Structures are given as structure tokens and as C-alpha cells.
């Protein structure tokens, strides 16, 4: 059975999310058209939230940045709008507990604005990048005698040469260097690598794990921030600590 309260709460939450995405779309349309006649403010803000909680508001330099984006489930009773759904699908972050590496430019800031309620954004350390590649690295690979391909681990180094040899990328450490240094062929290597499937922070429904889930939700409400204003700073957190937890 489906309850009237569930229906109505979903409708209201989805309508509010649609309104927020609409006002963000209008603001970014005006910002891209470079008109400051009628605008709340004409620049891009980033909020570093680290450890209560200390916040720093900074202006985007504009220089491309290697961001790590981890999909988390958004607020309940919100059915994802089509714009956010398309952006997340293009980033291939459709299901929760996954992560990708993304280039950060002025062409990517508004996308982060639109997808903010469903993702966690950070700047990973080289240790985090190396741990991700060396522990959870999977690719789609096809065989000569195999009609249909299948996804494999990144165990073999010769596959790297035989697939991406013309870009000079020879090994897994070359892939890691390209990502960490944000050099050329980074997009090709990112496409080659499947989205990193992370593990749930707490699993199980015993009394101990239920208490852990309660504590985790408390900390999440402390850290993640949901704002519906178009002048919303892109929120970035200790992705390194999150990855040490999830990896």
C-alpha cells in the first residue's frame, strides 16, 4: 500500500528541488551571458568544511582542479529532476557508493551546483588516489576469442599498453601520474577506468550497527549542507578522511 503522506511529502520535496534547480539554471544562464544588471552576485564560491566544524569561503581561481566526487543518496522524498539525472548519468554516478575523478573548470562549476544535493566533493591526496587505483581499479576488457566482453580488475599491466599505447601511457603508475598531475590524456584514462565502487560506511542491522548508522547520520547532518539559494558555495570536505573510511 502507498500512503497519502508519503505521496504528498514526495511531491512537496520534489517541487522544492525543481525550484532550486530552476533558480540555479537561471542564475548560471545570466552569469554565462555575462550580464550583471539583475543578479544576486556574479562569481563562484567554494566552501571548505573541515575539522566543531571550521568553514572557509573562497573564490574559484578558475584553474582546473582534480576533484573526487562520491555519490551519496540525496534527501528522502526527492525524486531526482531530469537535469540532475542527465548530469549524473553523464558523470556515470547513477547509483550510490561510487566515485569518479573530475576536472574542475568554469564549465564544470554550474554542473556541481546542479548536482550538489547528491554528491560529496573533495580534493584527494596522492595517497588517496594511489590507494583507490591499487585497491579498486576495474576496466572493461574484451578478448580475441570472446564474443562479448566483461569487466576485469587492473591486475595486468600489458593491457594498459595494448589499449592506450599511443598516448604514452604504459603502466598503472603512468595512469596514476596522469590523474594526480592532471595532465593530457587524463580524460582518456578516466574513460578507460570504471567508476570506483566504494563500500558502505556501515552495513547490517544489529543493535551495534544501528547505533553506528545513527551516529553516521548525525555526522552527515553536521557536515553536508542543503541550501536552495542560487548563490550557493560548492561544498567540499575531507574526501581523504571519507576515502580512508570507505576504502
Amino acid at each position: 500500500f502507498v500512503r497519502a503522506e508519503s505521496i504528498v511529502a514526495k511531491t512537496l520535496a520534489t517541487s522544492r528541488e525543481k525550484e532550486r534547480i530552476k533558480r540555479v539554471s537561471i542564475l548560471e544562464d545570466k552569469k554565462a551571458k555575462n550580464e550583471t544588471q539583475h543578479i544576486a552576485s556574479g562569481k563562484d564560491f567554494i566552501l571548505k568544511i573541515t575539522e566543531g566544524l571550521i568553514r572557509e569561503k573562497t573564490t574559484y581561481d578558475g584553474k582546473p582542479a582534480l576533484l573526487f566526487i562520491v555519490r551519496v543518496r540525496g534527501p528522502l522524498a526527492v525524486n531526482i529532476p531530469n537535469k540532475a539525472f542527465k548530469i549524473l548519468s553523464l558523470l556515470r554516478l547513477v547509483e550510490t557508493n561510487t566515485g569518479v575523478f573530475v576536472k574542475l573548470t568554469k564549465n564544470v562549476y554550474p554542473l556541481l551546483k546542479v548536482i550538489a544535493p547528491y554528491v560529496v566533493i573533495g580534493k584527494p591526496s596522492l595517497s588517496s588516489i594511489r590507494s583507490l587505483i591499487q585497491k579498486r581499479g576495474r576496466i572493461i576488457y574484451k578478448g580475441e576469442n570472446e564474443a562479448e566482453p566483461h569487466e576485469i580488475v587492473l591486475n595486468d599491466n600489458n593491457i594498459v599498453e595494448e589499449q592506450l599505447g599511443d598516448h604514452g601511457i604504459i603502466c598503472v603508475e603512468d595512469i596514476i601520474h596522469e590523474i594526480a598531475t592532471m595532465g593530457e590524456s587524463f580524460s582518456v584514462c578516466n574513460f578507460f577506468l570504471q567508476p570506483f565502487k566504494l563500500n558502505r560506511e556501515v552495513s547490517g542491522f544489529g543493535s551495534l550497527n544501528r547505533l553506528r548508522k545513527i551516529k553516521q547520520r548525525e555526522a552527515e547532518s553536521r557536515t553536508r549542507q542543503f541550501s536552495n539559494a542560487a548563490t550557493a558555495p560548492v561544498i567540499e570536505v575531507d574526501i581523504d578522511s571519507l576515502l580512508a573510511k570507505l576504502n
Partner: protein
């Protein structure tokens, strides 16, 4: 006696035609779901009507939802008697204003402004005021 049509009132926000139809479908097949809406700015008026294939399904829905508390609203559901079905309540959007053609040119509208000033001139004395120009 009783019909198969239901009047629903004291609705909260976010309970529109689609939401009402979705919720009351799991009671049975529906033939018409309509909601009162405001003309100028599209907004619900917190009442509506529903039509059931089975009058017994309609009565069951009324008994289920008669005095339901729903996010601060004490819903009201009544089975209507024979006839008196839904006749109106077309779903109205938020109306946007549209310009109308000014057939009267600059000269004609300036002469109209002159005549409006003349009407003020010949109206003030009858109203009971005395003032220059």
C-alpha cells in the same frame, strides 16, 4: 441513496489531481479526478472531486479517509447523492500577462489624454473641489 462520487476537502499543499488519483487508485479504478484551482496564479483551493466505478469502493474510501489527519489537515470525504457530478474545475496554470494591440496611435492616445484631463476639469466642480488647473 448514495452515488459513486466523492467530495474531498481540507487538502494540504502537494495533493493535486495526479497525487489524489495515485492515492485513491489503490482503492479501485477511477473515472474522473478533478481539483479546484485558482485562476490568476495557479494554486489549489484545497478541495476536489473523484469518481469511482464501484459505489461501494467510493463508500469504502469515504470510511477510510473521513477524518484522516494528514500533515496538519483533518481531511473530509463525503459520498455525494445521485447526480451532481463534476462539471468544472479545469486545471488552470499560472497565467502570464499578454500585451494587447494599441490600435490608437500617438495622436489618438494624446487626444484621449486631453479628453481625460477635460473630464477631470468638468468633474472636479461637481465633486466639490476648487483648485487651479
Amino acid at each position: 441513496e448514495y452515488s459513486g462520487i466523492i467530495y474531498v476537502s481540507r487538502l494540504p499543499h502537494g495533493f493535486h489531481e495526479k497525487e489524489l488519483s495515485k492515492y485513491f487508485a489503490q482503492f479501485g479504478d477511477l473515472k474522473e479526478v478533478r481539483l479546484a484551482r485558482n485562476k490568476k496564479t495557479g494554486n489549489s483551493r484545497h478541495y476536489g472531486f473523484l469518481e469511482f466505478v464501484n459505489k461501494e469502493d467510493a463508500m469504502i474510501a469515504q470510511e477510510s479517509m473521513n477524518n484522516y489527519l494528514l500533515m496538519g489537515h483533518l481531511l473530509q470525504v463525503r459520498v455525494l447523492p445521485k447526480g451532481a457530478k463534476i462539471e468544472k474545475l479545469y486545471k488552470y496554470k499560472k497565467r502570464v500577462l499578454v500585451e494587447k494591440g494599441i490600435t490608437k496611435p500617438v495622436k489618438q492616445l494624446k487626444d484621449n489624454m486631453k479628453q481625460k484631463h477635460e473630464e477631470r476639469i468638468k468633474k472636479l466642480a461637481k465633486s466639490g473641489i476648487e483648485f487651479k488647473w
